[PDB]
């Protein structure tokens, strides 16, 4: 089905046919194959590009964020999580998405929440299972300012209640973008006067995500770390582009430091001698 091209058996040649000669100036990539520049044998190639599919390539859960929130109200520790959803803080997944200019797809979101008890001299407890609450707040919705804010009522905002021990919570979401496709790159501004925000943040706005412990309080300080995972499915991509070369500096723009095109070597004719009997 997604099979690869076979190699036709070719023999000697001596004609005005010039498949090897061309002109890249046309912007046309040569469509030559081994059988065109040598004598080849017939080969029934059964190989398949099934795993090169944009679907199989991007459809794999990848971490996009991670924050920690405590249980007790001691010191200036955040007791809840806040996050302006986006996939530009994790270089791995961010680099893949940026292989294309525009994207369209549904998505499977999985959460890996783990807790712990902070070190201490006398910390003997017996706390029941910790239950967490993850609430999604689309742009404009009321934001909670405490682990007891009325906003956690989740009247209409989607929210998940998960208790430790059980399988990591998950749920799918459609294609939210108000545009016909998500934009990984936006060479424009937010204001017509050509100023303000520049790039991604200028238009993308998937809202925010908040988390917290629904448990009232813990005898001794404890903390939990939530890890968000994205897995696009039913994918569509447009306009491919040069992969990221320079390391990512900011998660709001494409700033970078002049990076080398590639690793170095002795000379253009350098090739390590691996045959030494």
Partner 1 sequence: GLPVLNTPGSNQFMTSDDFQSPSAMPQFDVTPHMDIPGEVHNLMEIAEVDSVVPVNNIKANLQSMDAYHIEVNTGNYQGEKIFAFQMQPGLESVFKRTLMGEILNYYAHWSGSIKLTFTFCGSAMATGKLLLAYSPPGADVPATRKQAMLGTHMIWDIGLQSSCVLCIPWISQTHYRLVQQDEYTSAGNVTCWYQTGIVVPPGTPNKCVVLCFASACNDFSVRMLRDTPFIGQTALLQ
Partner 2 sequence: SDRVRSLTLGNSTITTQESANVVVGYGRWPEYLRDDEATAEDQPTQPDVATCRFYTLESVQWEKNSAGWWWKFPEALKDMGLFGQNMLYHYLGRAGYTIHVQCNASKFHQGCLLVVCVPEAEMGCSQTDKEVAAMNLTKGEAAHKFEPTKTNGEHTVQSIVCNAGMGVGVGNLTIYPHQWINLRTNNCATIVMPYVNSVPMDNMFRHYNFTLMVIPFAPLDYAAQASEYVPVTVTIAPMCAEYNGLRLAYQQ
Partner 3 sequence: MGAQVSTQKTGAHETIIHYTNINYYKDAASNSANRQDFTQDPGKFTEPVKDIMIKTMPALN
Contacts with partner 2 by CB under 8 A lie at 7, 9-10, 23-28, 34-35, 38-44, 46, 101-102, 177, 179-183, 185-192, 194-195, 198-200, 238-246, 249-250, 253-262, 275, 277
Binders of partner 3 among residues 240 to 259 (CB under 8 A) are 240
Q: Shortest distance, CB of residue 114 to partner 1, whole angstroms? A: 12
H or E element that contains 133: strand 131-137
For residue 266, count CB atoms less than 10 angstroms from its CB and return exposed for 0-12, middle for 13-18, buried for 19 or more: exposed
Computed on alpha carbons and rounded to an integer, the radius of gyration of the chain in Å comes to 27
Assess contact for 207 and 139: CB atoms under 8 A.
yes
According to DSSP H, which parts of 70-157 are helical? 91-97
What is the C-alpha to C-alpha distance for residues 67 and 39, in angstroms, rounded to an integer? 60
Stretch in the footprint of a second copy (CB under 8 A) among 31-39, 109-117, 237-245, 252-260: 109-117
**Helical H runs in 64-147?**
91-97
Distance from C-alpha of 244 to C-alpha of 263, rounded to nearest angstrom: 15
**According to the binding rule CB under 8 A, does residue 174 interact with partner 3?**
yes
Pick from 69, 70, 80, 85 the residue near ligand DAO by CB under 6 A. 85
Which pair of structure tokens corresponds to residue 73?
A: 């109200």
The reply on whether position 35 binds a second copy by CB under 8 A is: no
Residues that bind ligand DAO (CB under 6 A): 85, 87, 97, 103, 109, 136, 158, 173, 176, 182, 184, 204, 206
Residues that bind partner 3 (CB under 8 A): 1-2, 17-19, 21-23, 25-32, 36, 48-50, 53, 55-56, 59, 104-107, 172-175, 233-236, 240
């Amino acid at each position: 089905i997604a099979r690869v091209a076979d190699t036709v058996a070719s023999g000697p040649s001596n004609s005005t046919s010039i498949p090897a000669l061309t002109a890249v100036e046309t912007g046309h990539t040569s469509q030559v194959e081994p059988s065109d520049t040598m004598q080849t044998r017939h080969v029934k190639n059964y190989h398949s590009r099934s795993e090169s599919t944009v679907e199989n390539f991007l459809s794999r859960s990848a971490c996009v964020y991670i924050e920690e929130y405590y249980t007790k109200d001691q010191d200036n520790v955040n007791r809840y999580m806040s996050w302006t959803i986006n996939a530009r803080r994790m270089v791995q997944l961010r680099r893949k998405f940026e292989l294309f200019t525009y994207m369209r797809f549904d998505m499977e979101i999985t959460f890996v929440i783990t807790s712990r008890q902070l070190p201490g001299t006398s910390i003997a407890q017996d706390m029941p299972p910790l239950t967490h609450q993850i609430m999604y707040i689309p742009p404009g919705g009321p934001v909670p300012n405490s682990v007891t804010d009325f906003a956690w009522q989740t009247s209409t905002n989607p929210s998940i209640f998960w208790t430790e021990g059980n399988a990591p919570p998950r749920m799918s979401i459609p294609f939210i973008s108000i545009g016909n496709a998500y934009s990984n790159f936006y060479d424009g501004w937010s204001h017509f006067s050509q100023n303000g925000v520049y790039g991604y943040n200028a238009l993308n706005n998937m809202g925010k995500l908040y988390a917290r412990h629904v448990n009232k309080d813990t005898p001794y300080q404890m903390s939990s770390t939530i890890r968000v995972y994205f897995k696009p499915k039913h994918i569509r991509v447009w306009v491919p582009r040069p992969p990221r070369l320079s390391p990512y500096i900011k998660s709001s723009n494409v700033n970078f430091n002049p990076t080398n095109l590639t690793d170095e070597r002795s000379s253009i004719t350098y090739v390590p001698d691996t045959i030494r009997p």
